[PDB]
Amino acid sequence: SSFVTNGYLSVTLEPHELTLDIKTNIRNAVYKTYLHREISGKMAKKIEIREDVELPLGEIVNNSVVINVPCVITYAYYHVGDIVRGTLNIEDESNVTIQCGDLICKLSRDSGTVSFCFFRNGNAYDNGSEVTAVLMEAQQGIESSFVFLANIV
Amino acid sequence: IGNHISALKRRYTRRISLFEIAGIIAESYNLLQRGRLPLVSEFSDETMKQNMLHVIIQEIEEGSCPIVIEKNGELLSVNDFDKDGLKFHLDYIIKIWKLQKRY
Amino acid sequence: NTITEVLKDSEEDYQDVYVCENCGDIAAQIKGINTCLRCSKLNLSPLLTKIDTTHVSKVFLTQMNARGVKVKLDFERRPPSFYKPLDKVDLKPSF
């Protein structure tokens, strides 16, 4: 459900960041732009900066600099059929979700009901209760987290 | 015989004109103006009381200019060009700058 | 550089704009998330990239899209390059 690779990550720096705090700025930018974001169906759960290989030249574009930082990336992903468990969350009568460490499960409307919040899919689940689900369909992630239409196991 | 022509062309690559030095100075000046760290020797609190163009010229002359230029499939620093041409163009540029009250 | 900056929009009018590499639409921002509506409707996950162009360019391309022409942009992903020391060259004559 995960793998590891060696690759370059592209990043952009401003001139005022080309000071003695260069490594700190590089690391902060890399984390900000790749830490927990889902891109092309995969997420980079852990990023290591080599610190032991030659840094390539930076490209000057308009008033900014572009750098290819070498790194070792630990990619993680999910597919259909995976069984996950997470805390239930209800914000309204139509939006019911399950929050995990790095995964969000969305429940279809024609699966249960919301009343008070509480969920009734054949059993009573309280707002914040922990429930098990199985991913069914994929979508685009939001706020650094996987999104999947899933049904309660 | 292709090797001979290749060597002649590689040597030809090292000549320097106004366009290239003007571009290098432009890049360095823009980056310095927008707030990068000067790379002169003996950097200290006194370095900030000079003229930025003096700083750029000093960096060029002492071989610490960070700009790298690509010309004919190669990558050259400002010190890989012929030295006499660099001096020639810099003399002209500094004269005209002095006329403008920049240097 | 002089003409490049003359023909450009004022640097004080900059803003972040994204484009979908698949169809060329200006990606919308819904609840703070960049999203291409057309490609999302088709169950696709294209790359959104930042561009810096003039407003009139966007107007012209949109109007061309109205007439039925699809305009797609690619971006350069050149591999990294490294500096190598170079031997000295004199170039003066033998006098």
Partner: peptide, 29 residues
């Protein structure tokens, strides 16, 4: 190039410029 707000391959723009960070990263506070 004018359409997309790029630098023409004329004069100073005939070349491509990089920045060498090697020396800067070899300095320590």
């Amino acid at each position: 190039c004018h359409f997309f707000s790029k630098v023409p391959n004329i004069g100073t723009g005939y070349y491509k410029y990089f920045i060498d960070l090697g020396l800067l990263m070899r300095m320590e506070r």
